[PDB]
Write a protein that binds this DNA or RNA. Sequence first.
DNA 1: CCGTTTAAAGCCGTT
DNA 2: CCGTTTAAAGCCGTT
DNA 3: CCGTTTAAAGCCGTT
DNA 4: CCGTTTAAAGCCGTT
DNA 5: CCGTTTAAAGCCGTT
DNA 6: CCGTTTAAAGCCGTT
DNA 7: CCGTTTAAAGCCGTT
DNA 8: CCGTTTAAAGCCGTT
Lengths: 57, 57, 57, 57
Amino acid sequence: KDTLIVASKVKAYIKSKGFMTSGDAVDGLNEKLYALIDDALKRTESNKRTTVRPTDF
Amino acid sequence: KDTLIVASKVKAYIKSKGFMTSGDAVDGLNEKLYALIDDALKRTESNKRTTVRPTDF
Amino acid sequence: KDTLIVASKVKAYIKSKGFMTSGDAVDGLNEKLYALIDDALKRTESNKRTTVRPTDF
Amino acid sequence: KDTLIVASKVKAYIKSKGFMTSGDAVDGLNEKLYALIDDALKRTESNKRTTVRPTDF
DNA sequence: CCGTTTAAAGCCGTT
DNA sequence: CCGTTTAAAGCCGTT
DNA sequence: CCGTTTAAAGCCGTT
DNA sequence: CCGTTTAAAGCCGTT
DNA sequence: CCGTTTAAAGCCGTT
DNA sequence: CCGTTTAAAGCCGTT
DNA sequence: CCGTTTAAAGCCGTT
DNA sequence: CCGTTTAAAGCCGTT
């Protein structure tokens, strides 16, 4: 639902590597980010934890 | 280098799924995000493109 | 459906790094592999291609 | 080093989805698979475990 | 297939 | 408890 | 065609 | 917001 | 140009 | 292994 | 910033 | 021990 990334920051970085960002690239990256977090929450739970660690991503 | 994600938004979502976020979780997620983008830029280039599309992620 | 990985080869490698493999680890890795390929096929198609390249993974 | 996937099985599946496999696609998929396992071994260790579980992938 | 044994899970008081 | 792996069982042609 | 970005428009307190 | 312009898409004959 | 796949070549015991 | 053929790459004018 | 408190880590005997 | 979050402190224009 909510945007979790800083579009301007992402475009800044992509530009710095000699590339451009499509109108719908950020929405797509945001979908991948949710998938990462949802994957991480399943790893947290399978380790009997309530606290997500960097290693769970 | 730069933070690309909204820590507060990430913690909000993780909380809503009945979990907590570690002090260093967001920095870890930020590393994964860079890896996603760096992977995507290699896909853009291998398709002879300068414009990153959502599909490249 | 079909197993795409060499269980014995995977266990060999995991052992060589000083770790063991759970009874259901390989089935789980096989699920991740399918997800990688299904992701790659969507990248192939979005580039108007029928031939999957290493870069699509 | 070692091939961990069944090239013929992978090509079989990719064919069944209406696509072809490049000469160097399988080597590329094999690299991604190693990256998955190396990622999984770091998750195993950070949970103070020696036994890789499906959830670690 | 099975025995050996290493490793994970369980319990509880501490951080 | 469970994964690893050594060892036993099975099959068949020889002694 | 489309993404980037420069430039114009909008708002308000000053000249 | 909009103009500029770079880049992607389209078409077709070759590899 | 390249990937797919059909077809030819190789090996050996039979006719 | 090799022939067939589908698909990707190349070129250029348009969007 | 800080206090509250939930959760993770530690220890050891069991599976 | 640590993450969450409530509460206190800081800044400034008013009473």
